[PDB]
């Protein structure tokens, strides 16, 4: 038996104004992955997506198409900037089953994908590109279609190698910032330290403060912090924490001369402060791309577990003297603070005794501070987490989420699957809470009671219904 999971069939970006006249149709395509496809096939897929948009603009001239479904692919569109359409073509699952005549046959499981997961992934692609490389039209006014195409290729040709659509789920519909639980005292200490640092480093312009890969503080705005958080916890922290799991024989840790009086150690830019000609290659992000359009060097300094993200303005080039001074200043302070928060978190974990695994496996998301919590997803690998419950229940949660959004009010949907698994979901006060209860032989009232009990244990200070 074979269960072919979904997989990125294609991805492209076009603009239906470029090459307005025939003989110039190839000028519509600004990017196409994979690039080895016959040119006529490129223009056929682009023509089909543009035709579908032009079609569903006959019935609602303001709301163009958002996804097209077929037998072997679902194609999700997106218009992030005026007339710059992106399209992602995913492949439906396949059940390949051996027949008794000796010929195994393929059945395209047409109705197994969720529109929301992959539309979110597509908008996430655009927003990550926006963070790391500007916008689409600013790049145009800067350097023409040639520069636009070059930037698009150089970013996406590498980015799309880390879209693992085989494991996309609800937590991608969410796209949230898993916060760290802290009390008044430690959080105010963190504010004191951040103000100290930013004032003793007068060129530092913005700041973020992560702990254990879970955000704590964020100087940036809200729309520009979720992308940067996804980048920090997907592509920055795992690669630079892996050497501590791969051992002394790593080709990067060997060139990492640490400091003895403080555990401070960089993660971007000059990673080894002793080589006197170390280069200051800091990643360079774009924030507030709507109003002020700032370009900032990103300096991730990581103590034991905590991690400050300083954002220096564009022109102010940090010299290696600046990096040595910054380490000398921040290392001891950040080591003290990281030890403080680690001790506090350990003591708070011990204070909550080892009660049996909470029989409600939930998922929580807060549409305003983008907090997000889950005990159905286990961190098997820190880059992307893998769930801990049946895939059937995950698709059930997907269907529930898809049934919610139709009106933005206080709703709740309880369900019992034929495995007798109870699945609850509430949407209220701009929050969504999905719960799974493996309670066999239950009834609706006991299940409502159980959701009440979990809500009182964890979200008591979080508005909800009884």
């Amino acid at each position: 038996e074979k269960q072919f999971p979904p997989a990125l069939l294609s991805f492209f970006i076009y603009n239906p104004r470029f090459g307005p006249r025939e003989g110039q149709e190839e000028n519509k395509i600004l990017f196409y992955h994979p690039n080895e496809v016959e040119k006529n096939e490129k223009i056929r897929n682009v023509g089909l997506c543009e035709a579908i948009v032009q079609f569903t603009r006959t019935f609602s001239p303001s709301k163009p198409a958002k996804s097209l479904h077929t037998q072997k692919n679902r194609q999700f569109f997106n218009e992030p900037e005026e007339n710059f359409w992106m399209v992602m073509v995913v492949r439906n699952p396949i059940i390949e089953k051996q027949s008794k005549d000796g010929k195994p046959v393929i059945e395209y499981q047409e109705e197994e994908l969720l529109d929301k997961v992959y539309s979110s992934v597509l908008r996430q692609c655009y927003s990550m590109y926006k963070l790391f490389n500007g916008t689409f039209l600013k790049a145009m006014e800067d350097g023409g279609v040639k520069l636009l195409k070059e930037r698009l290729e150089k970013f996406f040709h590498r980015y799309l190698q880390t879209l693992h659509l085989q494991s996309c789920d609800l937590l991608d519909i969410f796209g949230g910032i898993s916060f760290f639980p802290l009390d008044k005292m430690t959080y105010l200490k963190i504010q004191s330290f951040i103000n100290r640092m930013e004032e003793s480093l007068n060129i530092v312009k913005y700041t973020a403060f992560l702990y254990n890969d879970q955000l704590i503080w964020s100087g940036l705005e809200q729309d520009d912090m979720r992308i940067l958080y996804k980048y920090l916890t997907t592509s920055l922290f795992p690669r630079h924490i892996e050497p501590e799991l791969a051992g002394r024989d790593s080709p990067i840790r060997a060139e990492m001369p640490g400091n003895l009086q403080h555990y401070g150690r960089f993660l971007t830019g000059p990673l080894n402060l002793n080589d006197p000609d170390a280069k200051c290659r800091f990643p360079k992000i774009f924030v507030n791309t709507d109003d002020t359009y700032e370009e900032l060097h990103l300096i991730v300094y990581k103590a034991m577990s905590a991690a400050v993200c300083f954002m220096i303005d564009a022109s102010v080039h940090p010299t290696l003297d600046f990096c040595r001074r910054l380490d000398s200043i921040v290392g001891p302070q950040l080591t003290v603070l990281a030890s403080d928060i680690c001790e506090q978190f350990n003591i708070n974990k011990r204070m909550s005794g080892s009660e049996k695994e909470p029989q409600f496996k939930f998922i929580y998301f807060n549409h305003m501070n983008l907090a997000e919590k889950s005990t159905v997803h286990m961190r098997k690998t820190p880059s992307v987490s893998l769930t801990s419950v049946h895939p059937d229940l995950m698709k059930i949660l997907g269907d529930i989420n898809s049934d919610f959004t139709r009106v933005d009010e206080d709703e709740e949907i309880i369900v019992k699957a034929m495995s007798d698994y109870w699945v609850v979901g509430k949407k209220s006060d701009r929050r969504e809470l999905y719960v799974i209860l493996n309670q066999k032989n239950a009834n609706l009232i006991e299940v409502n009671e159980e959701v009440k009990k979990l809500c009182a244990t964890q979200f008591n200070n979080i508005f909800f219904l009884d």
């Binding site: 609602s60 479904h69 037998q71 369900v415 699957a417």
Partner: protein
């Protein structure tokens, strides 16, 4: 004529909620539901290309989704059907609605006669073969939007007296002619009794097409008009024949005698009176008329506070019951809105991959429960101020009122010729 009128028209032609078009595999408009058949070629020219575009590269267009309104494509050998809904209906349900429209076009003229007239010339205009008979296919959507038998795929039997049903069904059972297959006695979209040829089986899609046939035109009320009809789900090959005695000139109680040959008008039309006479002399005709005086039973009879409507279907037999939808859902719009909710629960509890057996939805409007088990599918609809305890209590109270009053509101014994 200035373009101002055309502008006002097409600006108000797109807010309609259930645009349905059906066209031929060439690109010639067969049927257009809310628009003129002339303009909505050019548009709907697009509609065949998009299908024949994705058909080139070993694929098929299956649906388009904006945010707010789906657009569903369905293909059958001689016709493609496209439905631009604006509702909360998953792609599958709209596909079922289009398949009903297609099985309807199959009922107007046989389905082995479409393959033939389109394998002979793909140029064949089909809007001048099934011309005039649009309101047979234009109301079927309205029945699809108000009557809940479609979403449930079962016939709603009339709540007749326990014994009177046996008498009327016996009067039916006696008049068995050789050129007969089914004898159906329906009363205004409800199934009083039915007697099929022995060891035969009817399909609810066919019953609903006959319901639409009768409820569509008014001619059926004057006298016995002997008409042909093919029931596509039973035998797609050839025609059947049936005629329509609206028994009492004031009320509406038609019996159906579907037959196997075309010129048996008299051999089976005798069965009309050979049936009516014994029933009328039994006096059971008076009890039938009296039950017909009020065929809809409200929900207050159940004696349940916080309960606005319900549907109940018995998997054992295959029929269902439902009160009159009356209290807030009276406006012909709220009727579809409520109807769409049971559509949601029925699709959500019958997803062959992931099946459920208890739902509950506590919204900013009617909040509903949907129980399902081996024997029966029970769907309800409350008032939003209903605690879960109150709903789980009403779901046993109503079930008791059903199991107690069952034999009155159902058809318990299948009658065979």
């Amino acid at each position: 004529t200035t373009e101002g009128d055309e502008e006002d028209a097409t600006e108000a032609w797109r807010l309609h909620q259930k645009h349905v078009f059906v066209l031929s595999e060439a690109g010639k408009p067969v049927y257009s539901r809310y628009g003129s058949e002339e303009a909505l070629s050019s548009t709907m020219g697009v509609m065949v290309a998009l299908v024949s575009f994705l058909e080139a590269d070993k694929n098929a267009i299956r649906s388009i989704h904006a945010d707010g309104y789906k657009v569903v494509f369905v293909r059958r050998s001689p016709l493609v059907l496209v439905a631009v809904a604006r509702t909360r209906q998953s792609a599958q349900e709209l596909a079922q609605e289009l398949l009903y429209i297609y099985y309807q076009i199959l009922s107007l003229l046989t389905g082995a006669q479409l393959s033939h007239i389109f394998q002979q010339k793909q140029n064949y205009d089909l809007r001048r073969l099934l011309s005039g008979s649009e309101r047979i296919t234009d109301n079927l959507l309205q029945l699809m939007a108000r009557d809940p038998s479609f979403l449930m795929g079962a016939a709603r039997c009339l709540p007749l007296a326990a014994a009177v049903r046996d008498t009327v069904s016996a009067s039916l059972q006696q008049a068995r002619a050789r050129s007969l297959v089914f004898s159906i006695l329906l009363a205004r979209n409800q199934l009083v009794a039915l007697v099929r040829r022995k060891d035969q089986f009817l399909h609810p899609i066919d019953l609903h097409l006959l319901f639409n046939l009768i409820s569509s035109s008014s001619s059926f009320r004057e006298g016995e008009a002997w008409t042909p009809v093919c029931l596509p789900k039973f035998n797609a090959a050839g025609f059947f024949h049936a005629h329509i005695s609206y028994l009492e000139p004031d009320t509406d109680l038609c019996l159906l005698l579907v037959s196997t040959d075309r010129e048996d008008f008299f051999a089976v039309s005798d069965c009309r009176r050979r049936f009516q006479e014994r029933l009328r002399k039994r006096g059971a005709h008076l009890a039938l008329r009296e039950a017909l005086r009020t065929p809809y039973y409200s929900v207050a009879q159940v004696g349940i506070p916080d309960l606005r409507h319900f549907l109940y279907k018995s998997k054992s037999s295959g029929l269902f019951t439902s009160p009159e939808i009356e209290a807030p859902y009276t406006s012909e719009e709220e009727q579809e809105r409520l109807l769409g909710l049971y559509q949601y629960l029925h699709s959500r509890a019958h997803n062959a991959s992931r099946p459920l057996k208890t739902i509950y939805y506590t919204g900013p409007n009617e909040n509903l429960l949907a129980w399902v088990t081996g024997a029966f599918e029970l769907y309800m609809c409350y008032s939003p101020l209903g605690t879960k305890a109150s709903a789980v209590s009403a779901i046993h109270k109503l079930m008791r009122w059903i199991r107690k009053e069952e034999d009155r509101l159902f058809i318990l014994t299948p009658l065979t010729y």
